[PDB]
Amino acid sequence: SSNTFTEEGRLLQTEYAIKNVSKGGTIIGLVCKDGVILLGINKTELLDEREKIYKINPKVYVSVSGLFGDAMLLKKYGQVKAQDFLYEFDYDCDIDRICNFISEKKQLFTQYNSTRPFGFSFIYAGMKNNKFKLCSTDPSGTINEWKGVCFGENEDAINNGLRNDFPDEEMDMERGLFEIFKILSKVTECSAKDHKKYEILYFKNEESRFLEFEEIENILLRIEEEKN
C-alpha cells in the first residue's frame, strides 16, 4: 500500500502507525494552574536513565509512545532544530515551534510514497503567552492541543476517564497528579501498584523538576486515605 489514498480516502499506513502507537507504554499529560504534568509508564524498571520523558529546550519537554527508534530519531531532530532556532534568533523557541518541526517531518514521511510513517506520538509540555500549553503530534503529523491526553496501552480508557470523571476544576499541580492517579486506578487497578516504573515531570517554564518514587507513594497515600 505505502503512502497512498485508498478508495475510502484513508492513508492505511498512517492509520496502522496510529494503531501501533496504542501498543506503546502509557503516557499522560495534564495542564494545571501552575504547570503541566508529564507522566510516562515504562514496561521495564529503570531509574538510572529516563526513557519516557525528554527535554528539548528549557521551555519544552516531550513524552514518547510508540516505535522507540523513530521516536528517538525525531527527538534528536527536534532538539537540533530547537538549537538551530536559538542560533538564528538568539532565544529559545516555544512549544509551538517544536510541534511545527516534528509535525512537518512527520507529514513529509506520511506523504512520501517510498517511506513509511513514524510509528510514535509525542506530548509537548511548554508555555506560550505566559500560559502553560500541552500539544500532541500523531504519526499523521496532526497537532492537537489538550487540557489532558493519554497515549499508549489503555490510552482509550484513560482518555475517556479524563473526559468523563475529571473534576474540571482549575487546581494545583499536586491535585492534578492526585486526580490523574485516581483515574488511573479507577480504569485499571494495576496503577495502584508497581510505581517504580513511573516517570512524572512537574513542568514549570523555568523550575521544571522530576518526581521520585517517594513523591509517587506520598501521592498514593492520598488515594489510600480517600478510597477507604
Partner: protein
C-alpha cells in the same frame, strides 16, 4: 499507482485525494461586496481536546486568510507554502503579490504533487479569501483546480449545504453562511463558530446569534 492513468481514463489517486479532502469538518462561507463571513464545523464535544483555529492569515498586510477541509497535516504544508509564496514574491519583485497570482501559485504548488510519482496528492480543499478592495474567495481543489466562489461549503457534506445555498432568496451573508452550516451539523455533537472578514479587520460572531440563526434549520 501515482502519476498514471487508469484503464477507464481516470486519475484514480487524484480522485481518492478528492474524497479524502471531502471527509473533513465542513466549512461554510458566503461573501458580499466589502465583507466575507464563514463558519467552521468543530468536534469539540470532547472538552479535553482544545479546538484549533482553522482560519489562519496568509499575509496580514494584504489581508489574505486561509482555511481548508480534509487532511489536517497537509493544511500546514499548504499554508506554509502560501506564506512563503507571498514573501518570496515580495522579495523578487519588490511589490505585494496580487491575490489572483497567489491563488495561481498555490494551485500550481498543489498540482506539483499530483504530477509526481514519488509524492502523495494533498488531500485538502483549501480556501483563499481576501477583503481589501472587494471580497474574493478562491477554493483550490487537491488536483490543482481553483476558481473564485461567491459562496459555498467544503467538507464531508458540502453537497447539501451547496444545494441549500444555491440561488437562495437571502442576501445577508452572516445568515446565509450560518444557516447553510446549520442544515447538516449535529448540534451538541459538532458545534458552530463563525468569523466575519472585513476590510483589513477580523471579528468573531459570538455563539448566541449563531445559535438563534441555526435554530431555523437544525430544528
Amino acid at each position: 499507482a501515482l502519476g498514471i492513468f487508469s484503464p477507464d481514463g481516470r486519475l484514480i489517486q487524484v480522485e481518492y485525494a478528492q474524497q479524502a479532502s471531502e471527509q473533513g469538518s465542513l466549512v461554510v462561507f458566503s461573501s458580499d461586496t466589502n465583507e466575507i463571513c464563514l463558519s467552521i464545523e468543530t468536534k469539540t464535544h470532547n472538552k479535553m481536546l482544545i479546538d484549533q483555529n482553522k482560519l489562519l492569515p496568509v499575509d496580514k498586510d494584504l489581508n489574505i486568510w486561509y482555511t481548508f477541509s480534509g487532511i489536517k497535516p497537509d493544511s500546514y504544508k499548504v499554508l506554509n507554502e502560501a506564506r512563503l509564496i507571498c514573501r518570496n514574491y515580495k522579495i523578487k519583485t519588490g511589490t505585494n503579490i496580487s491575490f489572483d497570482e497567489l491563488a495561481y501559485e498555490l494551485s500550481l504548488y498543489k498540482q506539483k504533487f499530483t504530477l509526481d510519482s514519488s509524492m502523495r496528492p494533498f488531500g485538502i480543499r483549501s480556501i483563499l479569501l481576501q477583503v481589501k478592495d472587494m471580497a474574493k474567495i478562491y477554493v483550490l481543489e487537491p488536483d490543482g483546480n481553483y476558481s473564485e466562489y461567491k459562496c459555498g461549503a467544503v467538507g464531508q457534506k458540502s453537497v447539501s449545504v451547496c444545494e441549500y445555498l444555491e440561488k437562495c432568496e437571502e442576501e445577508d451573508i452572516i445568515f446565509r453562511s450560518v444557516s447553510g452550516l446549520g442544515t447538516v451539523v449535529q448540534s451538541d455533537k459538532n458545534k458552530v463558530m463563525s468569523y466575519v472578514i472585513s476590510k483589513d479587520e477580523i471579528r468573531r460572531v459570538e455563539d448566541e446569534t449563531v445559535s438563534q440563526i441555526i435554530s431555523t434549520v437544525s430544528v
